[model samples]
Target: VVGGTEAQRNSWPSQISLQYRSGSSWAHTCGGTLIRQNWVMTAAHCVDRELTFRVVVGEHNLNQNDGTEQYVGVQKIVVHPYWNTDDVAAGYDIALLRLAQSVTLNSYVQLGVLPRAGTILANNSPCYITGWGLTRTNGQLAQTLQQAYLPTVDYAICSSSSYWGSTVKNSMVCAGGDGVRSGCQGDSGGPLHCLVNGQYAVHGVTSFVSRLGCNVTRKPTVFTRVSAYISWINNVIASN
Candidate 1:
């Protein structure tokens, strides 16, 4: 609950889902967001089309094996046009999943908002990013919805460095500085919620690349800004 204010920030859960796959797998496979009852937003670099994909939306505790999890087959998988396996920018690093069937929702599942451009990611915006991602890589994915706030960073300050200058695209947003709160590894594609109707909207997705640890403030983690891709999202969701 956002309490009519982001006393902390959040998404459309059924609109998004926690993805899972079996049989074939990789180390970097992370969480994803649901853009539609049938489509999910994920990291392109994390998987390929041939892989068996499962859309696991509408669950609050990814760490627990409790709540009823949905298992939908991937109808189609489309990665970002620029997604280059090697380049982070080319890694436009996003993917969409068309589920085999539409889903039904409960109190925990809902739709997220897409803010307009020129929007800002600010202080105490109350971004609570929960994930089943590992507390650490070799570590286990959280049994509960582990939470973190969006300690936003200024892109201008971040991109000043050559590493970020070239790769940090406008589609991405930055967070964490001074090495404090951060979104950890294995949390990719999970929603970064900001304010929306009575609660927070899915504004960004965790896409951390730093190995320094989620605590490092200087090494900001990158997230895909939903605002920047709202049209693509709306159009794509509508088309399906």
Candidate 2:
């Protein structure tokens, strides 16, 4: 997929910093998000460091957030409530992070809707994705924020890959190019947003898949279908 610049992702808030000290204490990783109250949207592979993770909401920069650290604690991690990491399914590679305290809605932190029922965003439809993920391997995380615009691909094209051919089911969408601007090694768990009702509602979560580059013309970014999880997501949003 063709990857876009991180400078483009600044429009969306609720983008988080998923951080952890590696076992060797040498690696520090960061990821982004789309959240409502205490429900944080991110990738399932991000669970690898969940035990020692911290979800920082409502701020753009990692070190600054008015110094108001809510220090969200994860009570439950619902990984698609159906996903298994080993040979895990692609479309279901999403996780709902329940925070100990719900975040106050802010200008930087906003909520969006899932894609409308019966439509999975048309092919070549415009969508937005953002993250603090590295633009290049071994590169520093973009301190500000960056985003990219991509067109959604049809199911047939996204499903041709040997790894995802049969599993790009009812709960997913595609973006990116054959190997250009697209999701990269560290952008997992970010939202794939579609503009509707005058604003962008998140319909998909970044999923793990290989790519020569971000936003590839033919290799689009794959997202978790949040629309089908309406009950599950609503349940978390309403009760939690």
Candidate 3:
């Protein structure tokens, strides 16, 4: 994240590091959320490549082991049928990954609570974006997990002519246009944990940011609105 600080290992237990098996090693490419015993939620764009992928739970530092990490292979990938790689701004960017084996829960690892269907945040709702993404646009990945405050920007304001205009959809959630703290490249597929009813829930799946830069004025980080697809998510899990 841009202008973020190191996150506590005990916080955001559902945040995961989605990695691809590169030559002789695995590399972190995106973030995800553990939503069930053997399921993860992420962005469709993160797993569009044919390379082998894995999910790392309880991960804090990328280069070093924290004794809490659990590596799991992906058994299935279910990208939303309506998702279009060519037109990400049109919405439907969510996807689910079924793990080869069920993961055990602990203080550092747990399932993320998702919001109710059709839930929409009021303008400036309190939230935070967390990941091991870059600290700046086009920068290298951070060695440790990071987080930044990212308040919500309602659909009306976000889709206004002076803002993202038609590119922003109601199916998307906008946050952090402060031109400071925001999600970056590696933060895609991560969670936008929002404080609601005195508890935090996964309200978004990190989707896109300003093409000109990671953080830009009036160009908040856009996320796949999770609440809009609660039924779709449940259907996928039930079928698979």
Candidate 4:
């Protein structure tokens, strides 16, 4: 996250790091939300490479040993059927990862709360985006997780000509287009937690940013609007 601060441990317990095996070590690829004991919500693009992946729960830092961490392998990947990598602009970037084993929950680890079905946030609603993504457009990943305050950009304004335009859809949420703080590489598949009625809920799955740069003016970070697909997520998890 550009122009963000290190997040406190347990501040976002549902936050997790999705990593891929690199040689003998593991490398962070994206962020995910633990929506269930064995189910995680992330971006479809994060698994596009077809590599062996693992989920790290209660993870605050990627480099150092965090006693709160719980590592587990993925058993099945359920990408949205309508998702088309060729056209992220069309939305449907969400994916669900079934864990090989159920992770134990504690103060350091917990399940993320999803928004009520079809719920939508008003413009500039208070929210935060958390992840271990790059600090800059092409910079290295942060040694620790970071978070940036990103208020919502309602669909009407976000889809306007000067903003994301037609590429921004009602199925997506826009935030932090201020060009200072935003989501970048490695932040994909992360959570966009929005405060609603005094409680925070997982309203977005970090999907994409501006093609021009990670933090571009008027091109706020785009996310898979979790509310738009609440039913789909429930059906997938239940049937699988």
Candidate 5:
């Protein structure tokens, strides 16, 4: 994430590293949220490539053996049916991955609490985007998890001509268009934790940044509105 600070070890327990086997070692590709004991929520584009993937829970550092980490294989992947790789602006960029086995819950590993169906944040509502994405545009991914305060930018303003315009649909949530702090490459599929009713909830799945740049002015980071797919998520979990 651009202009972000190293996140505390236990600050966001549900945050996970979605990695793929790279030759002899695994490499972090994207961030995801542990929404269930054996299910993860992420962006459909993150898994577009046909590669073996794994989810690492309770991970704070990518190059270190944190000991709190629990690596699990991906058993199945279910991308949103309407998601089209060629047209991310059309929305429906969310996906769910079933883990090979259920991960144990603890202070450093837990399920991310999801927002209620159809819940929408008020303009400028308090929120944070957490991930190990890039520290800047075209920069390397952080070895440690990072987080930035990215307050919500309501749909009306985000869809304005100067902002994301028609690309920012209601099914998506926009945040941190300050042109400083924002989600960048490798942050896709991470969580946008928003504070609502005195509690934090996973409200967004990091979707995309501006094509111009990662932290472009009036082009805040866009996310798949998790609340908009509550029923779809439940159905996928139930049927899978």
Candidate 6:
């Protein structure tokens, strides 16, 4: 993430590294949230490419052997039926991945709590975008997880002409238009944790940033509003 600080270990226990096999080693491609013991919530764009993917839970340093890490193979992927790769602005960019096996929960690895269906945060509500995206627009991904305080930018304000305009849909949530701190490449599919009723909940699945740049003013990071798909998520989990 641009203008972010290294996240403390175990701070965001549900955070995960969605990686793909590259050559002989695995490379981090995006971030995801552990929603269930064997299920992960992420952006559909993250799995658009057909490749061998894996989820690493409790991971801190990508290049280091963090003993707490638990690597698991992805057994199935379910992208929202309405998601259109050519038209991300149309929304429905969320996806769910079922793991090969259920992972154990602990202080460094736990399930992320989801917000209630139709829940919407107030304008400028406190939130943070966490991931190992990028430190700069075209920079390399961080070896460690990073987080930036990206307060919510309500739909009305974000849809203004000077802001995201028509690209910002109600099914999406916008945050951090400071032009300094924001989500960048490789951060897609990460979680936007918002403090609601004294508890942190996974409210968004990082979807996209401005086409001009990662941290463009008036073009805050956009995410798939998790609350909008609560029923869809439940149905998928129940039927899968």
| Candidate 6 whole-model C-alpha lDDT, 0 to 1 | 0.96
Q: After superposition, which runs of candidate 2 have C-alpha atoms over 4 Å from their true positions?
A: 1-3, 6-10, 21-34, 63-71, 116-118, 137-140, 161-164, 211-217, 237-240
Clashing pairs in 4: none
Residues 1-240 of candidate 3 have per-residue lDDT tens digits of 999989999989999999999999999999999999899999999988998999999999999989999999999999999999999999999999999999999999999999999999999999999999989999989999999999999999999987799999999999999999899999999999999999999999999998899999899999999999999999999999
Q: Rate the local accuracy (lDDT) of all candidates.
A: 0.59, 0.63, 0.96, 0.95, 0.96, 0.96
lDDT of 6 by residue, 1-240 (tens): 999999999899999999999999999999999999999999999999999999999999999998999999999999999999999999999999999999999999999999999999999999999999988998999999999999999999999999989999999999999999999999999999999999999999999998899999999999999999999999999999
Residue 110 error, candidate 6, Å: 0.6
Model with the higher lDDT, candidate 2 or 5: 5
Candidate 4 deviant stretches above 4 angstroms: none
Please list the Cα RMSD from the true structure of every candidate, rounded to 1 decimal place. 4.8, 3.5, 0.6, 0.6, 0.5, 0.5
In order of appearance, the predictions have TM-scores of: 0.79, 0.81, 0.99, 0.99, 0.99, 0.99
Q: Put down candidate 5 lDDT per residue, 1-240, tens digits, no spaces.
A: 999999999999999999999999999999999999999999999999999999999999999999999999999999999999999999999999999999999999989999999999999999999999999999999999999999999999999999988999999999999989999999999999999999999999999998788999899999999999999999999999
Residue runs of model 5 more than 4 Å from their true location after superposition: none
What residue pairs clash in candidate 5, if any at all?
none
Error of 3 at 39 (Å): 0.2
**lDDT (Cα) of model 3:** 0.96
TM-score of candidate 3 relative to the true fold: 0.99
lDDT of 4: 0.95
The residue-by-residue lDDT of candidate 4 on 14-131, one tens digit each, is 9999999999999999999999999999999999998999999989889999888999999999999999999999999999999999999999899999999999999999899999
Quote the lDDT for 68 in model 3. Answer: 95
Candidate 1 has an lDDT of: 0.59
